[PDB]
DNA sequence: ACTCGTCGCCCAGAGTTCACCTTGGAGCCAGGGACGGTTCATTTGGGGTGCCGGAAACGGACGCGTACAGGCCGTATAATGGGAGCTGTCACGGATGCA
């Protein structure tokens, strides 16, 4: 099943794998970040604008 | 009954060698021109030249436009984890991950 330590140990063991192929390793690394949407990207852009404005003020 | 073929013989000759006059020459020396290889005077027609006047080509300098070659920059519906590669070898000494 999904619970009672059935697949979590398998997932952890899979995550702890060499993956000697460089492209496969890069894909494994890139698969650890979830996708975003419109609200997330606009909030991130607002944060970018605030950070750039603060950096310009500091300079 | 007999000669023209063949024998010696006898004298003219002939051109041959010996040993005699002449006489056109080879050089032989002397003498005397004219002439040309040589030298020395002119002789002024011509070669020569240095040079800048200087006119003008020429070979380059110089300043300023033009042209592609290569480079930088930007495009605002959405577009969110990959193809692939063919692997019948044999031995083997040894490291190395898991026994």
- Tokens describing residue A29: 């690394």
Strand B positions closer than 7 A to protein CB: 80-83
CA gap A39, A43 in Å, rounded? 6
Ordered DSSP codes for chain A:
--SSSSSHHHHHHHHS----SHHHHHHHHHTTS----HHHHHHHHHHHHHHHHHHHHH-
Resolution (A): 3.3
C1'-nearest nucleotide to the CA of A41 = B80
**Could you identify the residue written with the tokens 């000697």?**
A20
Q: Does the CB of A35 sit below 7 A from strand B? A: yes
Nucleotide with C1' nearest the A23 CA: B82
Is A28 in contact with A18 (CB distance < 8 Å)?
Answer: no
Experimental method: cryo-EM
**Angle value at C-alpha A53, between A47 and A33, nearest 5 degrees:** 25
Q: Are A39 and A45 in contact (CB under 8 A)?
A: no
Tokens 């996708």, residue?
A35
Nearest to A14 by CA among A4, A24, A22: A24
């Amino acid at each position: 099943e999904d619970e009672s330590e059935a697949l979590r140990q398998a997932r952890k063991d899979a995550e702890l794998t060499a993956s000697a192929d460089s492209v496969r390793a890069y894909l494994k690394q890139i698969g650890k970040v979830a996708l975003l949407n419109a609200e997330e990207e606009v909030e991130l852009a607002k944060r970018i604008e605030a950070g750039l404005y603060a950096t310009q003020l500091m300079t």
